């Protein structure tokens with residue numbers, strides 16, 4: 001197991017433009033296209049991202065390429081964020097993947113907002129952080145996914161993803 005596999009399980013893969021859990025136009029492996037209510041605006045963002053007239057449909061290879069870029073950007077966003085960097089640096093490899101997953105899903109800003117949990121993770125107070133992480137809209141809106149990530153932070157193993 002690794003970050004790619006982990007996110008591929010959490011996000012799935014869809015070649016046509018679809019609406020995510022929040023109703024936003026997305027494509028491929030969780031690649032958010034726009035928060036605008038306009039399908040055309042979405043088609044437009046997809047073409048600009050891929051570099052061709054897609055007509056709202058990507059190929060597998062294109063999706064995978066977007067995915068690689070997105071993971072890369074998530075990591076780099078973490079390393080450049082003064083509140084995130086220090087946490088990431090203190091964590092072991094498995095837990096780091098947990099933090100990347102959250103950033104990919106909610107953006108650097110969103111995650112940096114979990115002040116209390118971040119402090120707990122930095123201090124290595126696993127059970128406590130897990131409880132605090134769960135008191136969030138994130139957990140209430142996407143509980144199955146949130147549980148997988150939280151277990152990952154709690155245990156430091158890939159147990160929640162083995163079976164998937």
Ligand SMILES: [Cl-]
Nearest residue numbers: 048049066069
């Ligand atoms: Cl892009």
Ligand SMILES: [Cl-]
Nearest residue numbers: 142143144145
């Ligand atoms: Cl979920």
